[PDB]
Amino acid sequence: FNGLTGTGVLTESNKKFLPFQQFGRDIADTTDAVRDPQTLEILDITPCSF
Amino acid sequence: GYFKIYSKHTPINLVRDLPQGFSALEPLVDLPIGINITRFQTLLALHRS
C-alpha cells in the first residue's frame, strides 16, 4: 500500500480514520490499519494467525 | 512544509469568556505549502455605509 509492504489478513474496518489521516500504526509501530488508496475505505490489518 | 487548518464548533454560555470544557480541534485537510510562515493576520469583511 503506497510503497509499504506488509503481510496480514485484510478485513473491512468499523474504525474510521480522519480525512487527513491515511494510515494507522500501533504501539509496536506495526501498521494497525491501512486506508485503501484507490477508494477511501479503512481496512483493518490483522497478521496471519500463528 | 505542511500547513493544517483546524475547525471546532463549541456552544459557549459566556458572552466572551472561553468555556471550561476541553474542545478537541479537527484538521480539515493537510496542505504541503513548502514555505515557512512567520506572520499571520485576520481578514475583515466590511461593507460601504
Side-chain angles (χ1 to χ4, degrees), chain A:
Chain A
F1 274 62
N2 301 16
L4 174 65
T5 58
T7 307
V9 186
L10 277 179
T11 51
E12 302 180 0
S13 175
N14 56 320
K15 340 164 184 176
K16 182 187 177 181
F17 292 150
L18 293 183
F20 84 101
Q21 301 176 352
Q22 173 68 30
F23 295 125
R25 300 184 176 271
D26 254 351
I27 321 293
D29 282 11
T30 64
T31 325
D32 192 25
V34 278
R35 181 167 68 179
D36 192 84
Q38 295 187 352
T39 189
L40 297 186
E41 43 151 3
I42 327 291
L43 305 173
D44 289 345
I45 298 180
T46 306
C48 329
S49 191
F50 58 97

Side-chain angles (χ1 to χ4, degrees), chain B residues 6-11 21-26 28:
Chain B
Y6 295 95
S7 73
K8 176 57 189 303
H9 323 292
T10 312
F22 297 81
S23 301
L25 269 297
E26 298 92 357
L28 290 325

